[PDB]
Design a binder for this molecule. Structure first.
Ligand SMILES: *[C@@H]1O[C@H](CO[C@@H]2O[C@@H](C)[C@@H](O)[C@@H](O)[C@@H]2O)[C@@H](O[C@@H]2O[C@H](CO)[C@@H](O[C@@H]3O[C@H](CO)[C@@H](O)[C@H](O[C@H]4O[C@H](CO)[C@@H](O)[C@H](O)[C@@H]4O)[C@@H]3O)[C@H](O)[C@H]2NC(C)=O)[C@H](O)[C@H]1NC(C)=O
Ligand code: NAG
Ligand code: NAG
Ligand code: NAG
Length: 516
């Protein structure tokens, strides 16, 4: 099982997957290690090796602070890295079906994590089931996060900004030059990702030099037009200078502020990263991204192709348990009105006190919901609608006004193995295990219905990658058009077709709230 690339030969391994076999290549380098003078710089093309690269084990994860908000709790630690942390982390993984195909569709996964955390070696990102069941080739790459991936000085090639996004772009370039040798069709590539990875996929749609590197796109719970996605270039010069003051590298000569940072330790950078305020994420760098995503969308400046977008029913709950008063994973988080208004101050830092009164009126005082859970559920809807759902709906509507086919889903199933409490519902991030087919292993002790639901989701995802349409006697997933705006619910009982998701709420965020 040796495949010959353009930089050398790589060895793989065969995995027993669901009574069959899947060939996996874990840890193929796609760029020179960004060590020394290459730190904070854009990735350089990988050098050649005459030997055989073994690629039989998940490579290193990029340096990142780990989540320690809930010690020992699996619901938080399942997202922490599971390999050694090092700056030498620019590697990718490939999963080829067995027997080897000849022109298989390729699906490339881009993990999320607020552009500060994440790795492709997580168990929930294991592509072997998807390659087995749907006979697609699955690719995933590690890209730099935090300051080491998004430290920005305007126009300074020592730290230009969006380095982590260029890491993804170079990994897409590797697929165009090498996936044919593995049995994949370089003209049938689909990008899919979740949260910050969905922001990444939607930024590749807005980056012209990425257009020829893929065919279609899938956005799970994220889009680059979200309020938290992209900063301006001056906003990114600040924070970069603020970090320099905290770490002790303040210079009046800018290009040598980076020479001081290149000689600090990676753990030293991570400890001062958090004191700056997404502290180091995508910016309008003028190279990868030339304008704010909302401007590029209004100008029609994006790749014209099909997209598949969707959100989960309870997007906001995961946000609230990490920094909102009254919320806890150890009780029902029944909050008072005072705690509600303090939650708005956290998630709406600059808005006025009348702006917060507008939110409270449209989500609470406009109706008669006198349940004890009113303020709690409404604050989940406020954060979910403002930060995830309504931006994703606006992204899909823009692609539809221009005449591109789009498909929208509404995930409603809560995993029977969800470790978080019940008040959090269908959380941000917990559709991924159904997309990657984890309920198919009967030893994982998912319900039989969850295995069926997972096979359905994997089929719809793979159909969209292969044919540009997720759809047969099953419930048809209609096209999302700008007028009717039909979407499909994803659940274990019976998927339903509805129209205009959260329409009243999104009309408040896009038509009325900007005016207060
Ligand atoms: C759900 O849980 C949250 C989180 O609380 C934490 O988990 C709980 C399961 C429980 O173990 C808690 O003890 C634990 O902190 C609850 O929200 C927290 O509520 C507590 C009070 O119950 C708040 O702590 C208090 O805050 C005040 C500062 O504004 C201050 O007056 C208090 O200190 C005084 O009183 C204590 C006695 O409690 C005394 O020891 C001190 O010396 C002092 O006099 C006290 O620190 C937390 O700030 C709250 N947390 C947040 C994030 O807001 C929540 O109430 C609970 N909900 C339900 C419905 O049960
Ligand atoms: C690569 O894998 C082969 C086959 O298992 C093994 O013989 C070899 O030792 C490995 N290479 C290294 C450097 O360990
Ligand atoms: C794969 O399909 C593309 C069109 O999608 C075609 O141009 C190409 O020749 C095919 N390659 C192989 C190896 O079958
Ligand atoms: C970043 O911006 C804040 C707000 O204007 C300012 O006070 C601070 O000095 C800036 N940080 C710099 C220039 O390092």
């Amino acid at each position: 099982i040796i495949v010959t690339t353009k930089n050398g030969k790589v060895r793989g391994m065969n995995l027993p997957v669901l009574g069959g076999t899947v060939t996996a290549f874990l840890g193929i380098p796609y760029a020179q290690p960004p060590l020394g003078r290459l730190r904070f710089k854009k990735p350089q093309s990988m050098t050649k090796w005459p030997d055989i690269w073994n690629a039989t084990k998940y490579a290193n994860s990029c340096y990142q602070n780990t989540d320690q908000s809930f010690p020992g709790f699996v619901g938080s630690e399942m997202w922490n890295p599971n390999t050694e942390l090092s700056e030498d982390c620019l590697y990718l993984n490939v999963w080829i079906p067995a027997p080897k195909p000849k022109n298989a569709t390729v699906m490339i996964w881009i993990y999320g994590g607020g552009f500060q955390t994440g790795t492709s070696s997580l168990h929930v990102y294991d592509g072997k089931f998807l390659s087995r069941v749907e006979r697609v080739i699955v690719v995933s790459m590690n890209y730099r996060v935090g300051a080491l991936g998004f430290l920005a000085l305007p126009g300074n090639p020592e730290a230009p900004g969006n380095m982590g996004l260029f890491d993804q772009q170079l990994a897409l370039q590797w697929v165009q030059k090498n996936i044919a040798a593995f049995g994949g069709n370089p003209k049938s590539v689909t990008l899919f990702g979740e949260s910050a990875g969905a922001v990444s996929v939607s930024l590749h749609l807005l980056s012209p030099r990425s257009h020829p590197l893929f065919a279609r796109a899938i956005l799970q719970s994220g889009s680059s037009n979200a309020p938290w996605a992209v900063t301006s270039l001056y906003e990114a010069r600040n924070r970069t200078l603020t970090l320099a003051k905290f770490i002790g590298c303040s210079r009046e000569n800018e290009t040598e502020i980076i020479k001081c940072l290149r000689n600090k330790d990676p753990q030293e950078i991570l400890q001062n990263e958090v004191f700056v305020v997404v502290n180091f994420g995508p910016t309008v760098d003028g190279d990868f991204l030339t304008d704010l995503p909302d401007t590029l969308l209004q100008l029609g400046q994006f790749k014209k192709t099909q997209i598949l977008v969707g959100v989960n029913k309870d997007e906001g709950t995961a946000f609230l348990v990490y920094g909102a008063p009254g919320f806890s994973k150890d009780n029902n988080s029944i909050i008072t009105r005072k705690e509600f208004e303090e939650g708005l101050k956290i998630f709406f830092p600059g808005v006025s006190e009348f702006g917060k009164e507008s939110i409270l009126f449209h989500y609470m005082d406009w109706t008669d919901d006198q349940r004890a859970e009113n303020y709690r559920d409404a604050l989940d809807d406020v954060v979910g609608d403002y930060d995830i759902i309504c931006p994703a709906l606006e992204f899909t509507k823009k692609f539809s006004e221009m005449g591109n086919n789009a498909f929208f889903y509404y995930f409603e199933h809560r995993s029977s193995k969800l470790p978080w409490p019940e008040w959090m519902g269908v959380m941000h991030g917990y559709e991924i295990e159904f997309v990657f087919g984890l309920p198919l292993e009967r030893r994982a002790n998912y319900t039989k219905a969850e295995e069926i639901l997972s096979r359905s989701i994997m089929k719809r995802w793979a159909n969209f990658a292969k044919y540009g349409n997720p759809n047969n006697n099953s419930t048809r997933w209609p096209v999302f058009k700008s007028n009717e705006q039909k979407y499909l619910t994803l659940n274990a009982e019976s998927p339903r077709v509805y129209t205009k998701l959260r329409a009243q709420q999104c009309r408040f965020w896009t038509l009325f709230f900007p005016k207060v």
